[PDB]
Amino acid sequence: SGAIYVGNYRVVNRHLATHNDWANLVWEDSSRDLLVSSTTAQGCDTIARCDCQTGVYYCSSRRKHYPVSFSKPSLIFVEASEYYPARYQSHLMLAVGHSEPGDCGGILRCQHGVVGIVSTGGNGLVGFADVRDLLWLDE
Within positions 32 to 51, which residues make up the interface with Zn ion, using CB under 5 A?
48, 50
Is 91 considered catalytic here? Answer: no
Residue nearest to Zn ion (CB): 52
E-strand stretches of 34-99: 34-44, 54-59, 64-69, 74-78, 87-96
Q: Is 65 annotated in some ligand binding site? A: no
Closer residue to ligand A1BQV (CB): 56 or 125: 125
CA distances from 135 to 51, 92, 131 (A): 14, 17, 9
Residue 50 interacts with, from Zn ion, ligand A1BQV, none (CB under 5-8 Å by kind): Zn ion
Contact set for ligand A1BQV, span 106-125 (CB under 6 A): 119-122
15 is catalytic: yes
Residue nearest to ligand A1BQV (CB): 121
Q: Is residue 33 at the binding interface for ligand A1BQV, with CB under 6 A as the rule? A: yes
Please check if 110 is assigned to a binding site. Answer: yes
Catalytic residue among 33, 59, 103, 130: 33
Angle (nearest 5°) at CA 43 between 131 and 54: 35
Give catalytic status of residue 65 as yes or no.
no
Q: What burial letters (b/e) apply to 16-37, b meaning 16+ CB within 10 Å?
A: bbeeebeebebebeeebbbbbb
Contact 45/65 with Cβ under 8 angstroms?
no
| Residue 112 marked in a binding site | yes
